[PDB]
């Protein structure tokens, strides 16, 4: 594991030190973000903590959109 | 924690920003002495003001105030020691008269032009800058330097570098390398 990297990563990535190393293959998996739901906060003041949270949740898992 | 470093501002910016009178009078002083910023001017007028500040504050003390005589000498001792105060004007409050120009005259940058040696004040600046021209054992490359007049005849091109013997320079060096390559061998 690496620390201090997370804030630059959405879900995945390749780390290189070459001036011109390429990316890495995109991990074809089987399941898909197909079953959706709708969310908002019970209390309106909490929306900022919700929009931040949704970015944080999207890092949690490799699939959730 | 260990003690604070003290530091100070060397310059002070004008109050009215767009009086052409000051804008032009500044630019004349630039081309004349080969300056770039108004900071170069501002630094000097701030010095000059930080100096009249002491000067008017001593004439208010009556003659024979031991502080008046003591730093009155100390001042002028430092001011014809550089040539920004002329030798006769050593008298007390000729100091209040100086404009900035007397300082830009005593700048190192100007002397290297007013002592032959440069052909143009803009040529003087870069001559100082590029590790040429020195005083004694000491090599100096700060255009604003305040030559002490003990030295305006103790400053020739430096012991190192061309224009001063003692090694040939490095642009002619590569230029004359191929002088023996397109000459057959």
């Amino acid at each position: 594991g690496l620390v201090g990297i997370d804030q630059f990563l959405l879900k995945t990535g390749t780390l290189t030190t070459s001036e011109t190393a390429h990316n890495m293959k995109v991990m074809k998996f089987s399941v898909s973000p197909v079953v959706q739901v709708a969310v908002e906060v019970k209390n309106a003041n909490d929306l900022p903590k919700l929009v931040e949270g949704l970015k944080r949740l999207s890092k949690s898992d490799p699939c959730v959109l | 924690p260990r003690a604070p470093r003290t530091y100070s501002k060397t310059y002070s910016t004008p109050k009215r920003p767009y009086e052409s009178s000051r804008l032009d009078a500044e630019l004349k002083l630039a081309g004349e002495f080969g300056l770039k910023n108004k900071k170069e001017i501002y630094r000097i007028s701030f010095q000059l003001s930080k100096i009249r500040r002491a000067a008017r504050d001593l004439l208010t003390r009556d003659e024979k105030d031991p502080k008046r005589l003591f730093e009155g000498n100390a001042l002028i001792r430092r001011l014809v020691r550089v040539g920004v105060l002329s030798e006769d004007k050593k008298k007390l409050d000729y100091v209040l008269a100086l404009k900035v120009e007397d300082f830009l005259e005593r700048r190192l940058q100007t002397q290297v032009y007013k002592l032959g040696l440069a052909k143009s004040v803009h040529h003087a600046r870069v001559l100082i800058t590029q590790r040429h021209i020195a005083v004694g054992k000491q090599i100096v490359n700060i255009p604003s330097f305040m030559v002490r007049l003990d030295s305006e005849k103790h400053i020739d091109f430096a012991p190192t570098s061309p224009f001063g013997g003692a090694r040939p320079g490095r642009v002619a060096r590569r230029n004359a390398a191929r002088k023996a390559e397109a000459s057959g061998e």
């Binding site: - | 630019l27 004349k28 630039a30 081309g31 080969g34 300056l35 770039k36 803009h122 600046r125």
Partner: protein, 56 residues
């Protein structure tokens, strides 16, 4: 109502025009040499009074 609809309107409409490669303008001391010269001796732009822009 009275939507945004038209936000970029003029900027999106103003026809693009390009900049042009130019003689590089000097920087530093050398530039105030130019202001000195271009205002005091061989300033080939004066016009009777002291004016800093021509509409020829």
């Amino acid at each position: 109502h009275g939507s945004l609809a038209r936000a970029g309107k003029v900027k999106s409409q103003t026809p693009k025009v390009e900049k042009t490669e130019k003689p590089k303008k000097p920087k530093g001391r050398a530039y105030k040499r130019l202001l000195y010269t271009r205002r005091f001796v061989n300033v080939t732009l004066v016009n009777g009074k002291r004016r800093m822009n021509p509409g020829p």
